[PDB]
Amino acid sequence: TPKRVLLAGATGLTGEHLLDRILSEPTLAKVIAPARKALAEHPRLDNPVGPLAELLPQLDGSIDTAFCCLGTTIKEAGSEEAFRAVDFDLPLAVGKRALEMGARHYLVVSALGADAKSSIFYNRVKGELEQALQEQGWPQLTIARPSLLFGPREEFRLAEILAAPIAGKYHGIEACDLARALWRLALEEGKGVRFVESDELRKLGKGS
Amino acid sequence: TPKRVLLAGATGLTGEHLLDRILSEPTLAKVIAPARKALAEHPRLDNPVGPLAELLPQLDGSIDTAFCCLGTTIKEAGSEEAFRAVDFDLPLAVGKRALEMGARHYLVVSALGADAKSSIFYNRVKGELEQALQEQGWPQLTIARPSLLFGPREEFRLAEILAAPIPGKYHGIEACDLARALWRLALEEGKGVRFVESDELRKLGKGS
Numbered sequence: 201t202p203k204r205v206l207l208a209g210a211t212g213l214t215g216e217h218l219l220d221r222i223l224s225e226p227t228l229a230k231v232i233a234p235a236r237k238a239l240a241e242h243p244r245l246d247n248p249v250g251p252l253a254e255l256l257p258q259l260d261g262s263i264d265t266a267f268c269c270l271g272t273t274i275k276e277a278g279s280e281e282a283f284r285a286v287d288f289d290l291p292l293a294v295g296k297r298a299l300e301m302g303a304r305h306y307l308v309v310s311a312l313g314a315d316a317k318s319s320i321f322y323n324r325v326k327g328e329l330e331q332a333l334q335e336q337g338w339p340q341l342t343i344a345r346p347s348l349l350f351g352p353r354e355e356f357r358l359a360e361i362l363a364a365p366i367a368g369k370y371h372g373i374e375a376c377d378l379a380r381a382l383w384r385l386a387l388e389e390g391k392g393v394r395f396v397e398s399d400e401l402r403k404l405g406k407g408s
Numbered sequence: 409t410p411k412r413v414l415l416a417g418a419t420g421l422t423g424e425h426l427l428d429r430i431l432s433e434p435t436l437a438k439v440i441a442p443a444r445k446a447l448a449e450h451p452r453l454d455n456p457v458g459p460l461a462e463l464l465p466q467l468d469g470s471i472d473t474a475f476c477c478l479g480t481t482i483k484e485a486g487s488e489e490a491f492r493a494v495d496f497d498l499p500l501a502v503g504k505r506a507l508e509m510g511a512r513h514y515l516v517v518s519a520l521g522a523d524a525k526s527s528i529f530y531n532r533v534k535g536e537l538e539q540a541l542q543e544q545g546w547p548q549l550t551i552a553r554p555s556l557l558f559g560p561r562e563e564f565r566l567a568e569i570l571a572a573p574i575p576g577k578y579h580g581i582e583a584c585d586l587a588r589a590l591w592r593l594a595l596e597e598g599k600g601v602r603f604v605e606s607d608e609l610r611k612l613g614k615g616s
Contacts, residue, residue: 240560372580
């Protein structure tokens, strides 16, 4: 079990479900959740409020396990550069800082089809992040690759349950499932890198 | 595992999460979800549409496990009779019909403080339902009693995640958890009556 957790993206839908789960775990020692908004107070929660990039250096404390639930789209970010800042630069910065704070396991939300050699911009950036994370020196690194699209007609994008909501019945189900999968993956002790694909995340998230 | 499931309240948020979850279980043989609206189609889903009282006698097929996720408030119903319809008459009729269809286990969402001898009308009706269910002849009967309020400030009423003939991000967290608890309780082998209180539901919902 994780003891001291860093959570990036707590105000996204997946992040909110995950944080509420983390706080319910009797063995949880501490969670640090830097965010753009105040979260409800809890004795085990450290919640500095402000922009993530500027908060990361200010973080005191130790961490063993970190989660990154960040993700946007080009449309919501306004440019390829603004998208890269959220989907590449920040997850990398969170990882680098987590290691400095003593972390041994980083769990990151990437996406189905992430591939640095893809012609698809979104998939390419996600793949570039995955490769960059593998160069940071993680004892354990778990990369979740949830489906890019969900809903009855695949009409909703993954980013809507991360950092790019557009205001959600299916959204709450998907966020709940993904958050459950991420916590379950954090219980699995290992060394090295694991990529967890959409069907695996479904079994972990929805299954008993 | 339950095999053939009757679900009342699929249009309420808890029932929505529970239905989605049930349909993902590899061992589920069939779900019958009579509902006030048409639901998304699924090969294992029988979805008669119309007023629940009209639908019940017309249901065909076998059932082993039934769930009832109905609930309103006195004020929303607008009368004692309309409240009793949703919170007493229909859950009782669902149970009666489920037994006729072969059911062995009924799981019902009641409420913290349900007591047929209470002076509080809401508590009295809920307790009267619980007592009446114990007269139907259930081999196994599980009665969940969630807290009346939930959320970061205890600002939401339980009924807002249940089904009525009438939600936000926190509603989704609570509905997801209650649905997880209900399914986990349905996996329990046993005979007789079990009341599951709020603390127990939190533990089962967050951890299972």
